[PDB]
Amino acid sequence: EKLAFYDYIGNNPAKGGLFRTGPMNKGDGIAQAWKGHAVFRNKEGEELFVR
Amino acid sequence: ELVNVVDEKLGTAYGEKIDLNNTNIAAFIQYRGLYPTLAKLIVKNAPYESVEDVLNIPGLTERQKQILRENLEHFTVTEVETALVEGGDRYNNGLYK
Amino acid sequence: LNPMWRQGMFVLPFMARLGVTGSWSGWSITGETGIDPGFWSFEGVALAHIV
Amino acid sequence: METITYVFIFACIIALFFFAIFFREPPRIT
Amino acid sequence: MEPNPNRQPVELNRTSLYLGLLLILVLALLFSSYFFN
Amino acid sequence: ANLWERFCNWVTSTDNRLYVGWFGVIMIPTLLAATICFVIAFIAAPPVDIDGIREPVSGSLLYGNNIITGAVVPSSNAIGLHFYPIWEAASLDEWLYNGGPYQLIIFHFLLGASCYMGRQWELSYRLGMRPWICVAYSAPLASAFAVFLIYPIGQGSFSDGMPLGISGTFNFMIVFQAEHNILMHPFHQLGVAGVFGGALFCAMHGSLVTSSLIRETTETESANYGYKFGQEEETYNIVAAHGYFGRLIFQYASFNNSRSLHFFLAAWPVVGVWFTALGISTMAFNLNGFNFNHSVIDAKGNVINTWADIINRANLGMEVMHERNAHNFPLDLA
Amino acid sequence: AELTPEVLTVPLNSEGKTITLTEKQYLEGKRLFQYACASCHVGGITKTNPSLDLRTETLALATPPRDNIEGLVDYMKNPTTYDGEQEIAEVHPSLRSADIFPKMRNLTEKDLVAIAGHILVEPKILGDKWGGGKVYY
Amino acid sequence: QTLTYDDIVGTGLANKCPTLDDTARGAYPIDSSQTYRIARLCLQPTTFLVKEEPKNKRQEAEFVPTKLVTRETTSLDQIQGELKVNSDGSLTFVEEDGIDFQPVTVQMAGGERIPLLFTVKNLVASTQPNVTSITTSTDFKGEFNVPSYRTANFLDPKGRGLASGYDSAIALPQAKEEELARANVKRFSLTKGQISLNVAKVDGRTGEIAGTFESEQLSDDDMGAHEPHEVKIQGVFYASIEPA
Amino acid sequence: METLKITVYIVVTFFVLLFVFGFLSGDPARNPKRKD
Amino acid sequence: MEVNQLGLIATALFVLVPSVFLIILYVQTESQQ
Amino acid sequence: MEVNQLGLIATALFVLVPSVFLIILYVQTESQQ
Numbered sequence A: 001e002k003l004a005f006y007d008y009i010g011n012n013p014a015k016g017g018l019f020r021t022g023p024m025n026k027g028d029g030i031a032q033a034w035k036g037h038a039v040f041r042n043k044e045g046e047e048l049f050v051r
Numbered sequence B: 001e002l003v004n005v006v007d008e009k010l011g012t013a014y015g016e017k018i019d020l021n022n023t024n025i026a027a028f029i030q031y032r033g034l035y036p037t038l039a040k041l042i043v044k045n046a047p048y049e050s051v052e053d054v055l056n057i058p059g060l061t062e063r064q065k066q067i068l069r070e071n072l073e074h075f076t077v078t079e080v081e082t083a084l085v086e087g088g089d090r091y092n093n094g095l096y097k
Numbered sequence C: 001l002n003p004m005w006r007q008g009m010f011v012l013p014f015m016a017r018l019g020v021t022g023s024w025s026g027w028s029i030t031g032e033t034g035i036d037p038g039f040w041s042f043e044g045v046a047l048a049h050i051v
Numbered sequence D: 001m002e003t004i005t006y007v008f009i010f011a012c013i014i015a016l017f018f019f020a021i022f023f024r025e026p027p028r029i030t
Numbered sequence E: 001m002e003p004n005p006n007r008q009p010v011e012l013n014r015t016s017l018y019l020g021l022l023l024i025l026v027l028a029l030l031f032s033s034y035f036f037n
Numbered sequence F: 001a002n003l004w005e006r007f008c009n010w011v012t013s014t015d016n017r018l019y020v021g022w023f024g025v026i027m028i029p030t031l032l033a034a035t036i037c038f039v040i041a042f043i044a045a046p047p048v049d050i051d052g053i054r055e056p057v058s059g060s061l062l063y064g065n066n067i068i069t070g071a072v073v074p075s076s077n078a079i080g081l082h083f084y085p086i087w088e089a090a091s092l093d094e095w096l097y098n099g100g101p102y103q104l105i106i107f108h109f110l111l112g113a114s115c116y117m118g119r120q121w122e123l124s125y126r127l128g129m130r131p132w133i134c135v136a137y138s139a140p141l142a143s144a145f146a147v148f149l150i151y152p153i154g155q156g157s158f159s160d161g162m163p164l165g166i167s168g169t170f171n172f173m174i175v176f177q178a179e180h181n182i183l184m185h186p187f188h189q190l191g192v193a194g195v196f197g198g199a200l201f202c203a204m205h206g207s208l209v210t211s212s213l214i215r216e217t218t219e220t221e222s223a224n225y226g227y228k229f230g231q232e233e234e235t236y237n238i239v240a241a242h243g244y245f246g247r248l249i250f251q252y253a254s255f256n257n258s259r260s261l262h263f264f265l266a267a268w269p270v271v272g273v274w275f276t277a278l279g280i281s282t283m284a285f286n287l288n289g290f291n292f293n294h295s296v297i298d299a300k301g302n303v304i305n306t307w308a309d310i311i312n313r314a315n316l317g318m319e320v321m322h323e324r325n326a327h328n329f330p331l332d333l334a
Numbered sequence G: 001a002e003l004t005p006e007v008l009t010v011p012l013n014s015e016g017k018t019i020t021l022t023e024k025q026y027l028e029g030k031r032l033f034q035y036a037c038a039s040c041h042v043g044g045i046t047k048t049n050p051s052l053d054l055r056t057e058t059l060a061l062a063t064p065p066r067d068n069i070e071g072l073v074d075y076m077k078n079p080t081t082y083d084g085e086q087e088i089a090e091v092h093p094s095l096r097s098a099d100i101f102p103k104m105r106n107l108t109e110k111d112l113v114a115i116a117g118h119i120l121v122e123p124k125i126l127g128d129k130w131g132g133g134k135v136y137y
Numbered sequence H: 001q002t003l004t005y006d007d008i009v010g011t012g013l014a015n016k017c018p019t020l021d022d023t024a025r026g027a028y029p030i031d032s033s034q035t036y037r038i039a040r041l042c043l044q045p046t047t048f049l050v051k052e053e054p055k056n057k058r059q060e061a062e063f064v065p066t067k068l069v070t071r072e073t074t075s076l077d078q079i080q081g082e083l084k085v086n087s088d089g090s091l092t093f094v095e096e097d098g099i100d101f102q103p104v105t106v107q108m109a110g111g112e113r114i115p116l117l118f119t120v121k122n123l124v125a126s127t128q129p130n131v132t133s134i135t136t137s138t139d140f141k142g143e144f145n146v147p148s149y150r151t152a153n154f155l156d157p158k159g160r161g162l163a164s165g166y167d168s169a170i171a172l173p174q175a176k177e178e179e180l181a182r183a184n185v186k187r188f189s190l191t192k193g194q195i196s197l198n199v200a201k202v203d204g205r206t207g208e209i210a211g212t213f214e215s216e217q218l219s220d221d222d223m224g225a226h227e228p229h230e231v232k233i234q235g236v237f238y239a240s241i242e243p244a
Numbered sequence I: 001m002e003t004l005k006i007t008v009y010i011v012v013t014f015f016v017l018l019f020v021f022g023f024l025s026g027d028p029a030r031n032p033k034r035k036d
Numbered sequence J, K: 001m002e003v004n005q006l007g008l009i010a011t012a013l014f015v016l017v018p019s020v021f022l023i024i025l026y027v028q029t030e031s032q033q
């Protein structure tokens, strides 16, 4: 989960605001668990990737 | 659904008579010939299935078998409640005068 | 999932960079319990800068 | 915010002691 | 104790007071919206 | 000369901003130890089990208190009168849980407070002064000895002493009334007359002197500038003040003598507080106030209640509620 | 209200005989109660065993009954438990134990019925204050 | 000859169970036709391990070491009970009376204090089948009851209790009572625990045995105010058995 | 804990000796007055 | 609206602190001569 | 603890406002003669 927590944009230091004060947990929340890796497929059955 | 177990038991025969399975020993003071000798035997041989099972306690003289028989009207038995028998509370429940 | 850089800690990483990792309360920023950092803990270096 | 407010006032009163003693107005005789 | 040879008085005339109060006030009127956020 | 002689001259030097002295050699470290521990304990000390029944009591600001409710909690009733320094606990965490800091503070304090009294004699001796200012300070000092040590001794536990807090002191007064009826004890009554008259005589003497100042200033500036530090003149007319107060009451109810007067101002509150200190010290050994419960009774035998029987009702309410789980038996004899 | 002979009239024993007391026997029976009993039985309770009292209703259902003169005089000569199965003269003041309770060597037959009179007349005065405890102070 | 009461007062040895020589490695004959008892059972806890606890559901969490703040008050002693010989040769110990409980408060990293009632009430512990003697390989595995850390007459800081006290938050007269239901209604807990007594030193001459123990139980739930903590207690024990 | 105990026993002994030998070092002669 | 809770005291001290700094300097200047 | 939100600015201004009143009067007195 530590490796999956890095690969995620909420920890990007270039997503803040000048007057968005406080810790990062004040933003998206206090991280609890890794829900998992999502895999998207259409009706043909091929894997799609989210941009 | 959280109920006070002591309050709930007051709505039963425990709140009307001497419950042989929960009531403190200081309740046999109400009637003649129960305290302290027979009162000690009743708490020692608890619990009882029915009130009449108290008449079969080992070593009861032919006649203390009878003072019981005159005081069955004030006896009852309910399910033994944990918060009422633990800590030796049937012998001293913290209530004096 | 809730490290120091998610809580807005500023001087805490600078203490941890040079070897101050444990607290008198018994915890460590690495997750290890049962440690004894001696005097030079987080509370010790803070008192050292106050005195 | 409360704990910081109480200790801040306490620190000012102690800092006030240091000036009222070592930086008082000297009493002079005449 | 001997006085210190290096001290000079400080002045602030009335015009600098109005200028200072003005700058302080509209600086607060500008940033207050961002402090409230 | 030698360095020890030079050291003794500095300790007793009358030219220091704050006088040290031989009493001060003991007073300074003991006080510094007590305040530094008190400040830290009042802010961040964990809860303390005072009554020894595994029921901790929060007392520090960081644990949900304010200035009014915060307090340094007395040591556990499981310790009683046992000496409990830091090195008698297996660690600090055990030391804080059993009210360790309370003993360290009051011990280093009473020590330094006593040396503070001797320090008053010491500087009086080096300045050519009469020595009896320390005797007046013995009244508030003996009071601190009563509520911090003499009473825990008579009751057998430091858990019964006065806590180091504002609301903690209020808890000490209420329980002391339920178990000793201090209000009906004469020594506390003599103590009230000492503090009521003390404030009365303070306001009186302060008003009469400020009623007869020699006119030496204008209306534009303060009246205090009519006096200058170190002047030989007395800045108020004493016989003019005697002529006013002697006519309000009668001539012989007024002090014409300044030295007899300031002695009365020093005597009254000091011996008055001496008694209220001795009142706490005696009720520590359970010699309580007057008991007039059911003392008036009619021709048949009905209890004709008085105002004392009502006081007994309020006392019963405090007694049955204080330390609601610390008792297992019908009598509270300590 | 006065200390009437009606108030001072109490049962003698079990058959329903009554004996009327003068004010002389009530006061000394009250003084002798403070002398030899009030340390344990102040206000009508029992310090060493609050489960029992000296109210008349309690003394009535005792075995043998003690809500009368002759029963109380017998209890102070040979005390028993609340049901009469044990004799507790070894732990309770009595004349059978006046060797180990020296305060009982004074009392004679006249003194013991005076105390017994006070135990029976006082609950007719204070009501629930007798044997009530701190709740009715 | 050894000690008096004035030789142990204040030393701390009054909290320690007796021990046996390292040379006491014998075996106690157990006659299948005689009755037997445990005259004295003593348990001294030396280590307290507490749970840990939330949050991520990743792995089965592990007991962390904790640190005692209630001093030398944690040992059980003078517990007597009947020792049976069952029909299959195994022996069951049935607890009856004794000082079989000590309230213990330990503290862990962070400052959180874990109150618990270290007890062995109503302990029944049996051995493996066919025990012809109590050797240095014998071990008991038992089950006991853990009553609530506080009984029914106990009151909280605001006066609420189970068998006494208020039944609401009197300080907030016109507040909503539903979220306060957990703290207003006190509940008496009654769970169970497990313990393993492994004898290590046996003196078949006098009938004394010694060894180690490890028990597991729950901590104080504050009469249903919060979830309790799992605790593991370790230490040594001493027991003397007697032909009755 | 034993190490801390020794330190306090030394610190306390150091200050009480400064106290006893302080008054014994001719204290009554330390007065703005007659010195004997 | 759900504003910042400290934006009030942040704005109050943003005005008060530098204002009385300039007031202190001006009043002591006029009092000279 | 759930304390009042205005209590912070209540204490802050309660200290600051009368403080600067005395400070202004003092600095303008020492700047005299």
Ligand code: CLA
Pocket: A018, A019, A020, A021, A022, A023, C007, C008, C009, C010, E027, E031
């Ligand atoms: C090197 C400086 C520095 C840095 C990088 C940080 C960084 C941090 N601190 Mg810290 N802090 C600092 C100094 C610093 N601190 C100091 C000196 C104090 C003492 C007052 C504090 C007290 C403090 C507290 C009490 C807290 C933080 C917290 C934080 C975090 C959030 C910061 C935030 O919201 O930014 C907000 C930044 C702004 C809104 C920028 C304001 C820009 C001003 C208004 C511009 C002024 C313009 C000027 C007047 C115009 C001039 C005009 C010209 C004519 C003159 C972050 C980790 C928080 C945290 O995460 O806690 C764990 C928290 O609770 N800090």
Ligand code: CLA
Pocket: F025, F026, F027, F029, F030, F033, F083, F084, F085, F086, F087, F103, F104, F105, F107, F108, F111, I008, I009, I011, I012, I013, I015, I016, I020
């Ligand atoms: C003026 C110095 C001074 C004094 C008098 C004290 C006094 C005390 N401290 Mg403190 N302390 C001090 C400075 C001082 N402190 C400083 C500077 C520190 C910081 C390191 C501490 C840190 C500290 C801690 C951390 C603790 C104490 C504790 C104590 C108590 C126990 C001390 C003890 O066992 O010694 C006993 C003394 C002796 C055995 C001396 C015997 C040898 C001499 C020569 C005998 C002479 C004295 C004799 C009895 C009478 C003669 C007196 C004279 C007038 C004739 C005691 C009230 C403890 C406490 O409060 O526990 C509740 C505790 O835990 N102290």
Ligand code: CLA
Pocket: F113, F139, F140, F141, F143, F144, F146, F147, F172, F173, F174, F176, F177, F182, F183, F188, F191, F192, F195, F273, F276, F277, F279, F280
């Ligand atoms: C009209 C109401 C009334 C009045 C006027 C009094 C008056 C008094 N009561 Mg009473 N009381 C009352 C009602 C009243 N009572 C009621 C209703 C109750 C029942 C609840 C009580 C219960 C009660 C108790 C239980 C006690 C009192 C005591 C007292 C006395 C307190 C003064 C004192 O001890 O000074 C003496 C001075 C001091 C104690 C201070 C010593 C200061 C030390 C030496 C130095 C401290 C310095 C400090 C730590 C740091 C300095 C700071 C600096 C560096 C800036 C006083 C005579 C107390 C008493 O007489 O004991 C002595 C006491 O114990 N009262």
Ligand code: CLA
Pocket: F188, F189, F190, F192, F193, F194, F196, F197, F200
């Ligand atoms: C209505 C006014 C009134 C009066 C007359 C008194 C009077 C008294 N109170 Mg009380 N008191 C009052 C209001 C009053 N109180 C109030 C409102 C409260 C708070 C609710 C209290 C709370 C209180 C407490 C808690 C206690 C008293 C006590 C006392 C006694 C000593 C007080 C004392 O010396 O004060 C100091 C003032 C002086 C010394 C100045 C002199 C005052 C005296 C009494 C005048 C005497 C003049 C004399 C009769 C004239 C002689 C003429 C000729 C022969 C030359 C005294 C009997 C104490 C007590 O019970 O003692 C028995 C006590 O413990 N008071």
Ligand SMILES: C=Cc1c(C)c2cc3nc(c4c5[nH]c(cc6nc(cc1[nH]2)C(C)=C6CC)c(C)c5C(=O)[C@@H]4C(=O)OC)[C@@H](CCC(=O)OC/C=C(\C)CCC[C@H](C)CCC[C@H](C)CCCC(C)C)[C@@H]3C
Pocket: F031, F034, F035, F038, F105, F109, F112, F113, F116, F136, F137, F139, F140, F163, F164, F165, F166, F169, F195, F269, F270, F273
């Ligand atoms: C509650 C009432 C009360 C208090 C608080 C008080 C306080 C004081 N009186 C003093 C003096 C006096 N008071 C006198 C008569 C009286 N004083 C009275 C009533 C009081 N007097 C009364 C009624 C009288 C008339 C009899 C005299 C005659 C004197 C003095 O000569 C003396 C003085 O110099 O006054 C100017 C000072 C002692 C200085 C000292 O020991 O420094 C040493 C202590 C220091 C430096 C710091 C100690 C801090 C400690 C360690 C804190 C921790 C322990 C505390 C006890 C915590 C408890 C606090 C809680 C209860 C909140 C101090 C300001």
Ligand SMILES: CC(C)=CCC/C(C)=C/CC/C(C)=C/CC/C(C)=C/CC/C(C)=C/CC/C(C)=C/CC/C(C)=C/CC/C(C)=C/CC/C(C)=C/CC1=CC(=O)C(C)=C(C)C1=O
Pocket: F201, F204, F205, F206, F208, F209, F238, F241, F242, F245, F249, F253, F254, F255, F256, F261, F264, F265
């Ligand atoms: C309708 C009708 C009939 C109309 C008729 C009207 C009429 C005029 C009638 C005439 C008849 C008439 C006069 C009747 C009298 C009736 C009468 C006696 C009424 C009773 C009233 C009464 C109870 C009065 C109370 C008496 C009273 C005030 C007592 C005070 C007692 C008391 C303790 C006094 C203080 C004494 C004292 C020692 C104080 C010391 C305090 C002190 C240290 C002060 C400091 C101080 C003192 C100085 O000394 C000076 C110097 C200075 C510097 C100074 O600091």
Ligand SMILES: CCCCCCCCCCCCCCCC(=O)OC[C@H](CO[C@@H]1O[C@H](CS(=O)(=O)O)[C@@H](O)[C@H](O)[C@H]1O)OC(=O)CCCCCCCCCCCCCCC
Pocket: F190, F191, F193, F194, F257, F259, F260, F261, F263, F264, F267, F268, F269, F271, F272
């Ligand atoms: C059956 C009973 C049998 C007897 C029993 C006896 C019991 C003890 C009796 C006590 C006698 C003691 C006499 C003391 C004399 C004295 O102190 O003189 C000292 C000075 C000298 O006076 C000044 O004296 C000067 C002359 S000279 O000094 O005396 O020579 C003079 O110049 C000036 O006018 C004058 O004011 O007296 C005064 O200044 C007058 C004020 C004295 C009042 C003291 C109040 C003390 C408080 C009392 C405690 C209660 C209050 C506290 C509790 C609420």
Ligand SMILES: CCCCCCCCCCCCCCCC(=O)OC[C@H](COP(=O)(O)OC[C@@H](O)CO)OC(=O)CCCCCCCCCCCCCCC
Pocket: F222, F223, F224, K013, K014, K017, K018
């Ligand atoms: C200008 C007056 C203002 C007085 C208001 C005070 C009312 C108090 C209640 C009555 C008590 C009366 C006893 C008076 C006593 C009396 O006799 O006074 C008389 C005195 C004037 O007397 P003289 O001119 O004789 O003064 C001689 C002087 O040289 C003093 O020695 O008046 C003052 O000193 C007033 C002081 C009030 C000081 C109180 C300070 C107020 C601080 C307020 C804090 C505010 C917080 C601000 C929040 C933003």
Ligand code: HEC
Pocket: G032, G033, G036, G037, G038, G039, G040, G041, G046, G048, G049, G052, G053, G054, G058, G059, G062, G066, G072, G075, G076, G080, G081, G082, G088, G092, G093, G115
């Ligand atoms: C000290 C303890 C005393 C003293 C000095 C006296 N009594 Fe009592 N008393 C005491 C106890 C512990 C008990 C109960 C014993 C038991 O039931 O096992 C009693 C009981 C009585 C009773 C009977 C009450 C009842 O049946 O409800 C009576 C009538 C009685 N005591 C009277 C009495 C008298 C007259 C005393 C002195 C003159 C006296 N007692 C002394 C304890 C104590």
Ligand SMILES: CC1=C(/C=C/C(C)=C/C=C/C(C)=C/C=C/C=C(C)/C=C/C=C(C)/C=C/C2=C(C)CCCC2(C)C)C(C)(C)CCC1
Pocket: F020, F024, F025, F026, F028, F029, F032, F033, F034, F036, F037, F040, F041, F044, F045, F046, F092, F101
């Ligand atoms: C030399 C000399 C001198 C000097 C002296 C001094 C200066 C001293 C000081 C001293 C000091 C200065 C001391 C101090 C002490 C202190 C203390 C004693 C403290 C303690 C504390 C504590 C114990 C704490 C704890 C805690 C708490 C309470 C809570 C939280 C946690 C903790 C742990 C932190 C003189 C002048 C006399 C002269 C002679 C010589």
Ligand code: OEX
Pocket: F155, F159, F160, F175, F179, F322, F323, F326, F332, F333, F334
């Ligand atoms: O501790 Mn504090 O207060 Ca003197 O009584 Mn007993 O103990 Mn408790 O009760 Mn009441």
Ligand SMILES: [Cl-]
Pocket: F171, F321, F322, F323, F324
């Ligand atoms: Cl209380």
Ligand SMILES: [Cl-]
Pocket: F326, F327, F328, F329
């Ligand atoms: Cl008790």
Ligand SMILES: [Fe+2]
Pocket: F205, F209, F262
């Ligand atoms: Fe004066």
